Design an enzyme around this catalytic site. Structure first.
Site, PDB file in Angstrom:
ATOM      1  N   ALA A  76       0.837  -1.200   0.000  1.00 17.55           N
ATOM      2  CA  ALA A  76       0.000   0.000   0.000  1.00 17.55           C
ATOM      3  C   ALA A  76       0.872   1.250   0.000  1.00 17.55           C
ATOM      4  O   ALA A  76       0.450   2.320  -0.451  1.00 17.55           O
ATOM      5  CB  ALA A  76      -0.904   0.015   1.221  1.00 17.55           C
ATOM      6  N   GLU A 103       4.453  12.850  -1.999  1.00 19.30           N
ATOM      7  CA  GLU A 103       4.949  12.237  -3.229  1.00 19.30           C
ATOM      8  C   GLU A 103       4.251  12.774  -4.475  1.00 19.30           C
ATOM      9  O   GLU A 103       4.902  13.072  -5.473  1.00 19.30           O
ATOM     10  CB  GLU A 103       4.805  10.706  -3.175  1.00 19.30           C
ATOM     11  CG  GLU A 103       5.715  10.032  -2.155  1.00 19.30           C
ATOM     12  CD  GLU A 103       5.691   8.508  -2.240  1.00 19.30           C
ATOM     13  OE1 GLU A 103       6.332   7.856  -1.395  1.00 19.30           O
ATOM     14  OE2 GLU A 103       5.037   7.961  -3.149  1.00 19.30           O
ATOM     15  N   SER A 154       0.689   5.472  -4.665  1.00 18.24           N
ATOM     16  CA  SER A 154       1.372   6.637  -5.210  1.00 18.24           C
ATOM     17  C   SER A 154       1.684   6.444  -6.680  1.00 18.24           C
ATOM     18  O   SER A 154       1.697   7.405  -7.448  1.00 18.24           O
ATOM     19  CB  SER A 154       2.651   6.913  -4.424  1.00 18.24           C
ATOM     20  OG  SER A 154       2.343   7.161  -3.061  1.00 18.24           O
ATOM     21  N   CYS A 185      -7.177   6.596   5.744  1.00 20.70           N
ATOM     22  CA  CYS A 185      -5.770   6.455   5.364  1.00 20.70           C
ATOM     23  C   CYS A 185      -4.798   7.094   6.355  1.00 20.70           C
ATOM     24  O   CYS A 185      -4.727   8.315   6.457  1.00 20.70           O
ATOM     25  CB  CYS A 185      -5.544   7.043   3.966  1.00 20.70           C
ATOM     26  SG  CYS A 185      -3.884   6.626   3.342  1.00 20.70           S
ATOM     27  N   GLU A 243       2.205   1.308  -4.302  1.00 19.91           N
ATOM     28  CA  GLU A 243       1.242   1.127  -5.385  1.00 19.91           C
ATOM     29  C   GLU A 243       0.252   2.276  -5.516  1.00 19.91           C
ATOM     30  O   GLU A 243      -0.094   2.676  -6.624  1.00 19.91           O
ATOM     31  CB  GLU A 243       0.485  -0.189  -5.214  1.00 19.91           C
ATOM     32  CG  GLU A 243       1.349  -1.427  -5.417  1.00 19.91           C
ATOM     33  CD  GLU A 243       1.778  -1.629  -6.867  1.00 19.91           C
ATOM     34  OE1 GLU A 243       1.590  -0.711  -7.689  1.00 19.91           O
ATOM     35  OE2 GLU A 243       2.312  -2.714  -7.181  1.00 19.91           O
TER      36      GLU A 243
END
Ligand code: HEM
Ligand SMILES: CC[C@H]1OC(=O)[C@H](C)[C@@H](O)[C@H](C)[C@@H](O)[C@@H](C)C[C@@H](C)C(=O)[C@H](C)[C@@H](O)[C@H]1C
EC number: 1.14.15.35
Length: 403
Positions: free
Chosen positions: A240, A359, A245, A350, A243
């Site tokens: 997690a 990012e 990002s 999240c 993937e």
């Protein structure tokens, strides 16, 4: 009368129009997926309520009399492998969930994420430095994919020589094809074996990375992470952790590239990138659907979801509910995106939001800043969207560095 088959092309080809048609009829409707009945929630109010209702469990390990719990995401997974993948925050219900999240929250902080900013910028610059000044390149293989994978590896203490294989296994895990159930389950075991070794190395040679920190994290009340919990949390953080990002950067690059006004706007004004990231997530949420299991009868939007039902909350479809987001099909980098569900809702919201925004912001800023005449290398209608309801994204995206 006709129950939608989530495997059909209707959910991978102009699939948001399909969501719209369903939402209109019933925001909570029965569907078929991987050989079992489920309920698809496409309405925003309904999806938010569903995620807020704890009777809708996130734990695939809980057992119920005469029931065989089957989360679609664990297709082809042996039980021991499932457990390795499902003994973490995202697969736990309170009170377990509560202590796990709090313990991890002690180390996966904003401070730790901000400390990485310089690394993210340098990695981003080095990757861009290597693509050249002109010609066509696959921005995924050369940027969107390598950046997040290197960042997460640095966060979790994954030495350089151990970063060339899991990307492949993770890719296979994202697709839930009944035809490749065996290959998917085998990719999962490779991930498990990779994590077991990583944990072994980290326990033996501690560092200043997050995994090393989690191995030591404790609290009078919360206690600490058991071996199984530590192993499973590490596993999910790894997958997690990059993937998502990768999807954000790829989809965001594609969206900005295919929306002249939005592209032009971003190129003129920088301080618009942050909200653009939010809108990119609202427009095409990577985690298109998130699964829940009805531990009790639960009524959502006037529909009685029977006990033991598998519930798929369509986060992505909720973000396009015109009742919540007017003119939902318009990608507007300036729109007020407050309330979208791309980062979840409720207790499972999240935990990596800070890192993801960092990012996305650093990546898109650098890319569109370094290449002012960047343009798609193919026709927008020819892009290939990953066939996944677990994590939407683009796995190959040709771009012309100099237009
Ligand atoms: C744009 C990127 C990202 C998106 C769209 C995203 C989205 C989500 C969503 C939808 C959930 C809720 C799942 C549910 O309700 O069952 C979630 C949970 C979570 N995310 Fe992310 N995420 C992103 C990046 C990250 C990163 C970078 C990490 C790890 C470093 C991460 C770690 C987690 C964790 C551990 C949870 C579990 C929360 C809990 O159960 O308490 N996320 N994420
Ligand atoms: C193969 C099944 C698993 O998927 C993955 O790990 C995917 C690679 C990630 O992209 C998922 C989609 C995440 O981004 C978050 C939405 C949810 C995550 C944090 C969980 O806790 C959740 C239990 C998850 O591990 C499983 C669904």
């Amino acid at each position: 009368t006709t129950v939608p088959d989530l495997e059909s092309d209707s959910f991978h080809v102009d699939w948001y129009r399909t969501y719209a048609e369903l939402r209109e009829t019933a925001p909570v409707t029965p569907v078929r997926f991987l050989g079992q009945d489920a309920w698809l929630v496409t309405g925003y109010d309904e999806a938010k309520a569903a995620l807020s209702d704890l009777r809708l469990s996130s734990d695939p390990k809980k057992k119920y009399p005469g029931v065989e719990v089957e989360f679609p995401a664990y297709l082809g997974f042996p039980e021991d492998v499932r457990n390795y993948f499902a003994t973490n925050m995202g697969t736990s219900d309170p009170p377990t969930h509560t202590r796990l999240r709090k313990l991890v929250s002690q180390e996966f902080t904003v401070r730790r994420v901000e400390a990485m900013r310089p690394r993210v910028e340098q990695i981003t610059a080095e990757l861009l430095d290597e693509v050249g000044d002109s010609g066509v390149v696959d921005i995924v293989d050369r940027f969107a994919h390598p950046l997040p994978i290197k960042v997460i590896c640095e966060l979790l203490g994954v030495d350089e020589k151990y970063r060339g294989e899991f990307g492949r296994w993770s890719s296979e895990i994202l697709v839930m094809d009944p035809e490749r159930a065996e290959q998917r389950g085998q990719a999962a075991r490779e991930v498990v074996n990779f994590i077991l070794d990583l944990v072994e190395r980290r326990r033996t040679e501690p560092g200043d990375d997050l995994l090393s920190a989690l191995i030591r994290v404790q609290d009078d009340d919360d206690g600490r992470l058991s071996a199984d919990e530590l192993t499973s949390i590490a596993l999910v953080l790894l997958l997690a952790g990059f993937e998502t990002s990768v999807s954000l950067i790829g989809i965001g690059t594609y969206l900005l590239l295919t929306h002249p006004d939005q592209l032009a706007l971003v190129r003129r004004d920088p301080s618009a990138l942050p909200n653009a990231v939010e809108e990119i997530l609202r427009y095409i949420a990577p985690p298109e659907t998130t699964t829940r299991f009805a531990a009790e009868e639960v009524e959502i939007g006037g529909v009685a979801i029977p006990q033991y039902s598998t519930v798929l909350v369509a986060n992505g479809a909720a973000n396009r509910d015109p009742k919540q987001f007017p003119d939902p099909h318009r990608f507007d980098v300036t729109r007020d995106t407050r309330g979208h569900l791309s980062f979840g809702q409720g207790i499972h919201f999240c935990m990596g939001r800070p890192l993801a925004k960092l990012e996305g912001e650093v990546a898109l800023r650098a890319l569109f800043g370094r290449f002012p005449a960047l343009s798609l290398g193919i026709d927008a209608d020819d892009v290939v969207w990953r066939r996944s309801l677990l994590l939407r994204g683009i796995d190959h995206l040709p771009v012309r560095l100099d237009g």
